[PDB]
Amino acid sequence: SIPKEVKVAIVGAGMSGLYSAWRLQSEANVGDLAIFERSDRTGGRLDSDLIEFKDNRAGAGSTITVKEEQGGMRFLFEGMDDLMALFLKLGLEDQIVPFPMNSGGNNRLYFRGTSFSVNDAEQDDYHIWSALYNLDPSEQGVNPKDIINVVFNRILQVNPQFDSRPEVRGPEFWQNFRLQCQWQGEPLYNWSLWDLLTDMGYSQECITMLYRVLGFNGTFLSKMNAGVAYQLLEDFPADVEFRTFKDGFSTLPNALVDKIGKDKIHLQTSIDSIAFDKADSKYVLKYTKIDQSGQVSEGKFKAEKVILGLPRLALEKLFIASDAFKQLPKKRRDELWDTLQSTSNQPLLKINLYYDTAWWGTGMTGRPAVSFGPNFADLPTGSVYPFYALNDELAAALMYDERHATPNPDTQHKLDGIDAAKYARPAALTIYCDYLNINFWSALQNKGELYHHPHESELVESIPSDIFPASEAVVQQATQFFKDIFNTHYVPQPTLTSARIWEGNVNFNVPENLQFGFGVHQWAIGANDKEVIEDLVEPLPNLFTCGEAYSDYQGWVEGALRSTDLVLQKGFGLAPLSEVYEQDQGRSSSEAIQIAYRKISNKMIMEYIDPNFS
Amino acid sequence: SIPKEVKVAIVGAGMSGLYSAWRLQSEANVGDLAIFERSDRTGGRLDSDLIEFKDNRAGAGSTITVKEEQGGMRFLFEGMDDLMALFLKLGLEDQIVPFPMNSGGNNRLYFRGTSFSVNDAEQDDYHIWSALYNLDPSEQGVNPKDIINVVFNRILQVNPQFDSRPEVRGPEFWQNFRLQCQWQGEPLYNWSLWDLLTDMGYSQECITMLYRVLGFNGTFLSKMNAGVAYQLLEDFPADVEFRTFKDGFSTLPNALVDKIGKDKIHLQTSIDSIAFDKADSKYVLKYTKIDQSGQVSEGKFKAEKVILGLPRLALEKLFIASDAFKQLPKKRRDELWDTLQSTSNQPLLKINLYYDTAWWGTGMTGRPAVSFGPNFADLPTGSVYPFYALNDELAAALMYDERHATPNPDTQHKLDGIDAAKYARPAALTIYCDYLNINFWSALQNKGELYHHPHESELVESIPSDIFPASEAVVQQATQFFKDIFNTHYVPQPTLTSARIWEGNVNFNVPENLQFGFGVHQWAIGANDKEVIEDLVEPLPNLFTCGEAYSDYQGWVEGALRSTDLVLQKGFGLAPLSEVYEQDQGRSSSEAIQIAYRKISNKMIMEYIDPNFS
Numbered sequence A, B: 001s002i003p004k005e006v007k008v009a010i011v012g013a014g015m016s017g018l019y020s021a022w023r024l025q026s027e028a029n030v031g032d033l034a035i036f037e038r039s040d041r042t043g044g045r046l047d048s049d050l051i052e053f054k055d056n057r058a059g060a061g062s063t064i065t066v067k068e069e070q071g072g073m074r075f076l077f078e079g080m081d082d083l084m085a086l087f088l089k090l091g092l093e094d095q096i097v098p099f100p101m102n103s104g105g106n107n108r109l110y111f112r113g114t115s116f117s118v119n120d121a122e123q124d125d126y127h128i129w130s131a132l133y134n135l136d137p138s139e140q141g142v143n144p145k146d147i148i149n150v151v152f153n154r155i156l157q158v159n160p161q162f163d164s165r166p167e168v169r170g171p172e173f174w175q176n177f178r179l180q181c182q183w184q185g186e187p188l189y190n191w192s193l194w195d196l197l198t199d200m201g202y203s204q205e206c207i208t209m210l211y212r213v214l215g216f217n218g219t220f221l222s223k224m225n226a227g228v229a230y231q232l233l234e235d236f237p238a239d240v241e242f243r244t245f246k247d248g249f250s251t252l253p254n255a256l257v258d259k260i261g262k263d264k265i266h267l268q269t270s271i272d273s274i275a276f277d278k279a280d281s282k283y284v285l286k287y288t289k290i291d292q293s294g295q296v297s298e299g300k301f302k303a304e305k306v307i308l309g310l311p312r313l314a315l316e317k318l319f320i321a322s323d324a325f326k327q328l329p330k331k332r333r334d335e336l337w338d339t340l341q342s343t344s345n346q347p348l349l350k351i352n353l354y355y356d357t358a359w360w361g362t363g364m365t366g367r368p369a370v371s372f373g374p375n376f377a378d379l380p381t382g383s384v385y386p387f388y389a390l391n392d393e394l395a396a397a398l399m400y401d402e403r404h405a406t407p408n409p410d411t412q413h414k415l416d417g418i419d420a421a422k423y424a425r426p427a428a429l430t431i432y433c434d435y436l437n438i439n440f441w442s443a444l445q446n447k448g449e450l451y452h453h454p455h456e457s458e459l460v461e462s463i464p465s466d467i468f469p470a471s472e473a474v475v476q477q478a479t480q481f482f483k484d485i486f487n488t489h490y491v492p493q494p495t496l497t498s499a500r501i502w503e504g505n506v507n508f509n510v511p512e513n514l515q516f517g518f519g520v521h522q523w524a525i526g527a528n529d530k531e532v533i534e535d536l537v538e539p540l541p542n543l544f545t546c547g548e549a550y551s552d553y554q555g556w557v558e559g560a561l562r563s564t565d566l567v568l569q570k571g572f573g574l575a576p577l578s579e580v581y582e583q584d585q586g587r588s589s590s591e592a593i594q595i596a597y598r599k600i601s602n603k604m605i606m607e608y609i610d611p612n613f614s
C-alpha cells in the first residue's frame, strides 16, 4: 500500500536511504516518511550471503555456514567516525571480527606468465620485478607499492602550505590534498595519475607494473583524477587492521531495517519521475510498482521533502524524466546536469566460487598455505580473496593474530592446528576486479549456459534469492586462472557460484534482479568537489541528494553516511552523527569502538586460544 | 536564412548527410532539401588540413604544403564499391595517390621498454617476441599478426556451412561471418575477441602482445563482439595497397558541397528536437542557430521527410528531447532506445605534430630511414604515422614502388635521391590511438597551457580554423615517446600542432569547436545487426536514420554510404550507387577505378621516374 502523501519521501533503500530514515525517526521525530526501492531487496551495494552447507564429512543433519560478500566486505576503526558511531548506537560492535589481509608472505602473485609468492618477490632485493618488467634503474630494487608511497611523500614535500600532520588522515585531509596540492603548478585534481607518474619520469613498464600489482587499475587508466586516486591508494597500508561483521556487511542495513519497520519500506517500487505541485507546495512522485504476482501498477503520490539516496546514473535517469528538472531555466538545468558529470563511474564485479573444502592449503597444493588477503595477478582475475566457513575458534585465533603477541610453543601449536583446520571445511574464493578487467567477464557471464553443480540440492540447503549463478564459461576460465595463480594442477569444480557485475545499465531488456549501478565512483579530472558537494545537497527547494557517488569518502560506506549527514543538517538541523555521538558519550566513536573491540577480542582469545593471555 | 518548410530535412553535414542531398538532387530531382549542421564546418569525421609553410631553406615568398588528416586518411579500390563509384562520378580519380604502409622493414616497434625495427623483429625466428613476452610454446616463433590470421582460418574451418569463397570479402561476407559462424556452439557476435582467444588456449601474455602490436586495442578490450573485431583486423593484409587523395580525404566532401550548393547548407545550426504535426502530416524541427556575431537564435521549421545522418550519441540526444519519440508507446520507445545501444562507441584521437624538416631519416638518426606506415608501440602513442610535404616527384616514386617492377641501377639511383629528399622538406607525425590509450592524452590535452612555437606567424602562413593546438604537456610527452620509438636523442620542438579527440561529449560547458562524436563504432556483444540495420532505416514514418555508426562497414566511409543507400532505397526508390554505376557504365566501379588509376600511375611514372617503363 503506497501512501497518498508523506512528509519525507526517501528514494533508494541503500545505506543512505536507510540511514536517512533511521536518523529522521530517531532524532527528528519524523514518523511520516517512506522508503521506495526499485529492487526486491534492501542494502544496495552492501550484499552479504549466508550459505548453509550440508555437513557431509564422515563423522557428522548438522550445518556449516559460509559468509560471502557480493558488495562491500570491510571497514576500519579509524577514519570512519559516522560508521563507528552507527555501529555502537545499533549495538553491532559484538559481531565485529578480523578481516585479515595477508598470509605472512604466502599470498600469491601472478605476473607475465609467472606464479610466485609475496615472500618470493622480496628475495634478492625485489629482483623478480626487475626480471619481469623492463624497469629504469631508479625503479628497480624497491617494493612496487613503496613507489606509490614515495611519490605521495614527494607530493607532500613540494606542498608545504599543505598541513600534512593529522595522524588520522580523514576525508577533510584527502579533500584538501586533491584540491590544494599541485605538481608543476597544476593542482592534483587536474592531473590523472597516469599523466602524473609519466611526467615524474616513470617508465610505462613501471606504471603498468604498478596498476597490475595493485589489482585495481581504474586509479591509473580511468577518468578519475590523481588526487582522489591517492585517497584510495593510501587506504591500504601494510599495517592495516581491517574488520568486518561475522554475518557480513548486510548485518548493518538489516539492523537499520529492524529499527525502521518493514511497513515504511516499499520494495519493487521504482521512482520514475518527479514534479512539483506549485498549488500545495508539494513534490509529486511517479512510480512503477511490481506486485508479488508480477502485476505491474503505475501511480503517483506527494511529498513535502524528497531525499534522493541515489548514485550518478540513477540521478541522471530521474533528472531526464522529471518535470521538476525540466521546468528549470536552461542555464541552471544545464549546470545541474554538468555537475552530475563530475564523478566518474567505476565498474566493479565480484564472482564468488564456493567449494566443499578449500584446495589452496598446503595439504592440497604441496606449497606454502594461502590464508587471507588479496592474491594479485595481471590476469583478468585482478584480485582473489579467500573466505572460510564461520568458526568461532578461527575468529579468536585471528583476533589473537592481530595482536603483537608472541605465542609460546603450546599456544603456537594450537594456532597451527586452527590455521590448518579451516581448509577441511567449506570455503570460497572471490574474484574481485575493476575497470580494465570488467569486459572480460561480462561477455563471459552473458554467453552460453549458466553453471550448476549436479546435486546442488543435496549439498546446499536453500540458495538465497540475490544469488545469480556464474556462467559455465566464467567457471571454466576462473578455474584455469586459479591453477595459474595458486601454481597447482588441482582446482575442483565449485559447489555453488554467484556473479555480480556492478556496472550501470541503460537497457530496458534487463530483468529487475540483474540491474545494478556502478560499483563505486571517484571524482573526475577537473572536478572541484568542494563546490560540487555543496551544490548537490539541496539542488531544488526541499529535494535532496546524497550517497556515496558524490561524497567525501568515495568507495566506502562512510562516504554515503557523511553525504547523507549534509542533507540531515541542511534540511533538518541534525548535526553529524559522529559529533552527536561524542556529545552523548563524552568520547569519540573511534575511541569507543577500539575499547569495546579490545574487550570482545580479549575474551575471545582467553576463551579459545590462551587462557593466560596478556 | 532558415526556410519555413522543406521536402527533405537532412541533419548532419557529414558524409551521409552530404551524400544524401547529392543523390537526391541528382537522381530524384529533389531540389527542396536543406542540410543542418551544428558545427562550423562540413565533413564530420573527414577533416583534412593543408598547411602552407614558408619555404625557408637557403635557396628559395615561395610555399610548401603539408597535407594532414584529423580524421579519415585512406581507402581501398576493392570492397568499397559505393566510394569508388562516388569518386568516379565526381571526377576525383585523378587526385588519387598512394598511401604506403611500410618502409621495407625499417618501421619502428617499441614494446616493454625496447626499441627495434620490423626487420629486427623477424630475426632468429621472431625471437624478440619470445624474449619480450612470456609466451606458450605454440605462441613462439611466429609473426604475431599471423596468430590473428591463423585463428581466422580456424574459425572458417569449423564453419563449413559458411561459404568463405568470394575473393573480394565485402560487407555481406563480414556480416555473415559474424552472424553465422560459431565457436564452441556460440555464434561470433556473442563472443568477445578477448574471451575467444582465451577459450582457444592463448596466454594472457600472448593476448596482450596481440592488442599492443596491432596498435589498436578496442578490438580486444572493448564491448565490440569478436565477429566485427575480425572484420577490422582482416582489413590490413600485408599486401595492402591503400590510397588517399593528394589534398586529403576532405577533397570528397568539399566536392559534394560544390555540387549541392552552400545555400542549402546551414552551418552552426543544431537540431535540438523533433515533433510531428498530425494536422498537416509534417515533422517539426526545433533548432538553435549561432550567427557570425555569436548571436544565438532559436526557431522551428517543418519537413515532409527527415534524414538523420547521425551516429549513436547524437541520435540518443535527439531521441531523449523529441516529442516524436516520446509520444511513442512505451514498448516501442524502449525497444528503439535499446536498438540504439547495439553499436559500441569507439573513441579515437589524432595528434598531429608538424616539423620544418623530418628528423626520422637516416641523416638525422644514423639508423635505417623510417618512411611510411604505422610505427607501433605499447606506449600511449599506440601508432605513429609520418606525413610529408606534397611533392609530385615523391608521389610518382611511390606509384612506381607499388608496382612489382624491379628498377635498373639508374632508376634505383633516382628513387634513392627521391626517398632521401623528403626529409629535407616540412613533414609531420600523427599520433593515432584508440580505446585504452585515450584517457592518457585527454587529461594531458586539457591540462595547463596550450603549445605555441614562437614566431609561428613567421613560418606558417595561415592556420586553418579546424586546428586546435596540442597542450604543452601533450607535446612534452609525445616528444619523449618519439625518442623512445625512433631510438634517437634528437627530437626537436614542433612548428605547429593539432589535437583532435574523437570522444563523445555530454557536457554543456564545451565550446562548439571542441564537441566531437565518437571516432568510430562497432557492433556490440549480442547485436544481431541484420535486424538492427533494417530497424533503423525508417524508425518512424518518413523519418530516416543512416551513417557509419549502425552500418555494414563500420570504421569506414563506405559504411556511411551503404547505410545511406538503404534510406535512399526505402524512402525514395534509388538503387545502390554501385549498382547504378554499373548499369550506366557497363562495368563495376572497382574495375573502372583500377583502370583509371593505372593510367594516371603509368603517366606519373613515365613523367618523373623511368621514361622507358613497362
Ligand SMILES: Cc1cc2nc3c(=O)[nH]c(=O)nc-3n(C[C@H](O)[C@H](O)[C@H](O)COP(=O)(O)OP(=O)(O)OC[C@H]3O[C@@H](n4cnc5c(N)ncnc54)[C@H](O)[C@@H]3O)c2cc1C
Pocket: A011, A012, A013, A014, A015, A016, A017, A036, A037, A038, A039, A042, A043, A044, A045, A046, A070, A071, A072, A073, A074, A075, A269, A270, A271, A272, A309, A310, A311, A314, A348, A349, A350, A502, A517, A518, A519, A520, A546, A547, A548, A549, A555, A556, A557, A558, A559, A560
Ligand atoms: C564491490 C564493492 C565492494 C565494496 N566494498 C566496500 C568495503 O569493503 N567497505 C566499504 O565501506 N564500502 C564498500 N563498498 C561501498 C559501499 O557498498 C557503498 O559505498 C554504499 O553501500 C553505497 O550506498 P548508497 O546509499 O550511496 O548507494 P546504493 O547502495 O547504490 O543504494 C542506492 C539504492 O537506490 C536504489 N534505486 C536506484 N534508482 C532507484 C529508483 N529510481 N527508485 C528506487 N530505488 C532506486 C538501488 O536499487 C539501490 O538500492 C563497496 C562497493 C562495491 C560495489
Ligand SMILES: Cc1cc2nc3c(=O)[nH]c(=O)nc-3n(C[C@H](O)[C@H](O)[C@H](O)COP(=O)(O)OP(=O)(O)OC[C@H]3O[C@@H](n4cnc5c(N)ncnc54)[C@H](O)[C@@H]3O)c2cc1C
Pocket: B011, B012, B013, B014, B015, B016, B017, B036, B037, B038, B039, B042, B043, B044, B045, B046, B070, B071, B072, B073, B074, B075, B269, B270, B271, B272, B309, B310, B311, B314, B348, B349, B350, B502, B517, B518, B519, B520, B546, B547, B548, B549, B555, B556, B557, B558, B559, B560
Ligand atoms: C580518426 C578516424 C580515422 C578514420 N579513418 C578512416 C579511413 O582511413 N578511411 C575511411 O574510410 N574512414 C575512416 N574514418 C571513418 C569516417 O570518418 C566515417 O566513417 C565517416 O566520415 C562518418 O560519416 P557520418 O556521416 O556517418 O558521420 P559524421 O562524419 O560523424 O557526421 C555527423 C555530422 O552530424 C553533425 N551533427 C551531430 N548532431 C547534430 C545535430 N543535432 N544537428 C546538426 N548536426 C549535427 C556532426 O557535427 C557531424 O558533422 C575514420 C574516422 C576517424 C574518427
